[PDB]
């Protein structure tokens, strides 16, 4: 039986319904979203960390001159000085008075500790929601891992579940993200080959062990004005460290809809944002005929101590007489009040108690037991506990959040205004027939 409904994307909060095929008994069906998985498609751009700015030994040729060719080393910087006179331990280093050429040499590489303290720049795209579904029907359970794209079935064979496209696309990640040590940030990093000195992404490479390392850290080799051999250098501060200053806070503490970010496939887990249309093809083996199901001769619900809150606050007891002892689906036919129990055991006569959670000040709703329809009416008190540690099972509605007493007051005032309108037009029509007489 193909049954189509809409479940919320909230983890937990079982969504209960009846599938009512005509010739067969009503069958319970609840779907629970155990987990959710926003996994965007990520493209790796580069890896950055703190650079090492290694400076090789100064190369001097005296009574001579030097020039360097271009090198593939990251942030290559040569400079030639023609008036040096180096003084290591033991006097002058060579044999010419004034004309002496020194090659100041500078380039950057990855630090030895970048195998851990590194940041990966990623570009993401649209994310696909994968939801784990606990679906129970009759006395049978099923655990599925479905995709919300709207065409891919679940991974359980026998129960075919199509999870339709979700109403709103969330995508907590911006188009560019940065991953460092399990923490994810929405940072607009520079593109590959588009570095800026002093900012994030001074040094870039496709891997830690890659030799194609690029950088444009602003290093300037100053003229050696001291006796001793030296390569004076002025360099920009590490932009990875400067980003560690002003990284802000990660998406584990910033992301909307209260869902947590993980980094091994970079997924957003348990985002409760939208509504998932769902269609289930329940096999005919689950359905039993109406003959084998017990039938209810008489049912009446009396509800005591109802309270509209997140918890199942309120106890309605069904007093029932039925011919055959057996098991019976029980359901609430209102989108505002949901029952805790889906099935009960019915004897020849007696009463069963049931717990429900509602979001309306009035408990007027239809409860079904082995089919059937009974109507329950009560005034539900506001909660005394201000804040609860579990979420609301149901959503508020405008027609239900307004109580029956308030509805009577507003309709009495509006009907009074309308009655004055009607009597005004009636006396105007009487004046019209009087001026027709005149």
Partner 1 sequence: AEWITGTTSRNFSVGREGLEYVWGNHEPVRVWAQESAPGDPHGWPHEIIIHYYHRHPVYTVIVLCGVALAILVGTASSAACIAKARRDCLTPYALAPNATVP
Ligand X SMILES: *[C@@H]1O[C@H](CO)[C@@H](O)[C@H](O)[C@H]1NC(C)=O
| Residues binding partner 1 (CB under 8 A) | 249, 253, 258, 308-310, 359, 361, 379, 381-392, 396, 403-406, 409-410, 413-414, 416-418, 420-421, 423-425, 427-428, 430-431, 434-435, 438
DSSP run (H or E) holding 241:
helix 239-245
Give the residue ranges of DSSP H helices in 118-268.
239-245
Tokens representing 161? Answer: 């579940």
Q: Choose the contact partner of 425 out of a copy of itself, ligand X, partner 1, none; CB within 5 to 8 A by kind.
A: partner 1
Q: Of 66, 288, 417, 420, which one interacts with ligand X (CB under 6 A)?
A: 288
Q: Choose the contact partner of 188 out of a copy of itself, ligand X, partner 1, none; CB within 5 to 8 A by kind.
A: none
Q: Choose the contact partner of 138 out of a copy of itself, partner 1, ligand X, none; CB within 5 to 8 A by kind.
A: ligand X
The DSSP secondary structure of 180-194, one letter per residue, reads ETTEEE---PPPTT-
The Cα 216–Cα 53 span in angstroms is 12
| Least Å from the CB of residue 84 to ligand X | 32
Q: Which of residues 98-157 bind ligand X (CB under 6 A)?
A: 138-139
Tokens representing 314? Answer: 């309120």
The Cα 191–Cα 189 span in angstroms is 6
The Cα 193–Cα 171 span in angstroms is 28
Under DSSP, is residue 153 helix (H, G, I), strand (E, B) or coil?
Answer: strand
Return the residue matching tokens 């093809």: 281
**Residue 222 or 388 with smaller CB distance to partner 1:** 388
Rounded to a whole number of angstroms, the distance between the first and last alpha carbons of the chain is 73
Q: What angle do CA 78, 74, 84 make, to 5 degrees?
A: 20
Does 190 interact with ligand X (rule: CB under 6 A)? Answer: no
**Residue 24 or 51 with smaller CB distance to a copy of itself:** 51
**Residue 158 or 397 with smaller CB distance to ligand X:** 158
Q: Choose the contact partner of 153 out of partner 1, ligand X, a copy of itself, none; CB within 5 to 8 A by kind.
A: a copy of itself
CA neighbor of 278 nearest in space, from 112, 185, 412, 151: 151
- Cβ distance 148 to 131 under 8 Å? yes
Does 228 interact with ligand X (rule: CB under 6 A)? Answer: no
Q: Choose the contact partner of 407 out of a copy of itself, ligand X, partner 1, none; CB within 5 to 8 A by kind.
A: none
Tokens representing 237? Answer: 């501060």
| Least Å from the CB of residue 288 to ligand X | 5
Q: Which residues contribute to the site for a copy of itself (CB under 8 A)?
A: 151-155, 157, 191-194, 214, 216
| Least Å from the CB of residue 311 to partner 1 | 9
Number of residues engaging ligand X in binding (CB under 6 A): 5
DSSP run (H or E) holding 335:
none
The two most distant CA atoms of the chain are separated, in Å, by 137
| Least Å from the CB of residue 177 to a copy of itself | 16
Does 26 interact with ligand X (rule: CB under 6 A)? Answer: no
Q: Which of residues 322-341 bind ligand X (CB under 6 A)?
A: 327
In the complex, the residues that contact ligand X under the rule CB under 6 A are 138-139, 245, 288, 327
């Amino acid at each position: 039986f193909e049954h189509a409904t809409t479940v919320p994307n909230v983890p937990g909060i079982p969504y209960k319904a009846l599938v009512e095929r005509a010739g067969y008994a009503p069958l319970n069906l609840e779907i629970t979203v155990v987990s959710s998985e926003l996994t965007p498609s990520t493209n790796k751009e580069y890896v950055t960390c703190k650079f090492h700015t290694v400076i090789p030994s100064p190369q001097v040729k005296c009574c001579g001159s030097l020039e360097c060719k271009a090198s593939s080393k990251a942030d290559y910087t040569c400079r030639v000085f023609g008036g040096v006179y180096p003084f290591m331990w033991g006097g002058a280093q060579c044999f010419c008075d004034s004309e002496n050429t020194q090659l100041s040499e500078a380039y950057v590489e990855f630090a030895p500790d970048c195998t851990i303290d590194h940041a990966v720049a990623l570009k993401v795209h649209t994310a696909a929601l994968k939801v784990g579904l606990r679906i129970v029907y009759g006395n049978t359970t099923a655990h599925l891992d479905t995709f919300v794209n709207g065409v891919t079935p679940g991974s359980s064979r026998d129960l075919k579940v199509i999870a339709g496209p979700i109403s709103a696309a969330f995508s907590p990640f911006d188009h560019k993200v940065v991953i460092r040590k399990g923490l994810v940030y929405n940072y607009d990093f520079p593109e590959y080959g588009a570095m800026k000195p002093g900012a994030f992404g001074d040094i870039q490479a496709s891997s830690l062990d890659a030799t194609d390392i690029v950088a444009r850290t602003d290093i300037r080799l100053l003229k050696p004005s001291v006796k001793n051999i030296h390569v004076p250098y002025t360099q920009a501060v590490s932009g990875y460290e400067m980003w560690k200053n002003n990284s802000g806070r990660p998406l584990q503490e910033t992301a909307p809809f209260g869902c947590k970010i993980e980094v091994e496939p970079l997924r957003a887990s348990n985002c409760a944002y939208g509504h998932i249309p769902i269609s289930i093809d329940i096999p005919d083996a689950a359905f039993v005929r109406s003959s084998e199901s017990p039938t209810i001769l008489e049912v009446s619900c009396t509800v005591a101590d109802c309270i509209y809150s997140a918890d199942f606050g309120g106890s309605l007891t069904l007093q029932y007489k039925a011919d055959r002892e057996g098991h019976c689906p029980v359901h609430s036919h209102s989108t505002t009040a949901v029952l805790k129990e889906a099935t009960t055991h019915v004897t020849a006569t007696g009463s069963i108690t049931l717990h429900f959670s509602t979001s309306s000040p009035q408990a007027n709703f239809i409860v079904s037991l082995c089919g059937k329809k009974t109507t329950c009416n009560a005034e539900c008190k506001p909660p005394a506990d201000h804040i609860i540690g579990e979420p609301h099972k149901v959503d508020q509605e405008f027609q239900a959040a307004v109580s029956k007493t308030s509805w009577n007051w507003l309709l009495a005032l509006f009907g009074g205004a309308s009655s004055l309108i009607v009597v005004g037009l009636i006396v105007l029509v009487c004046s019209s027939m009087l001026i027709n007489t005149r």
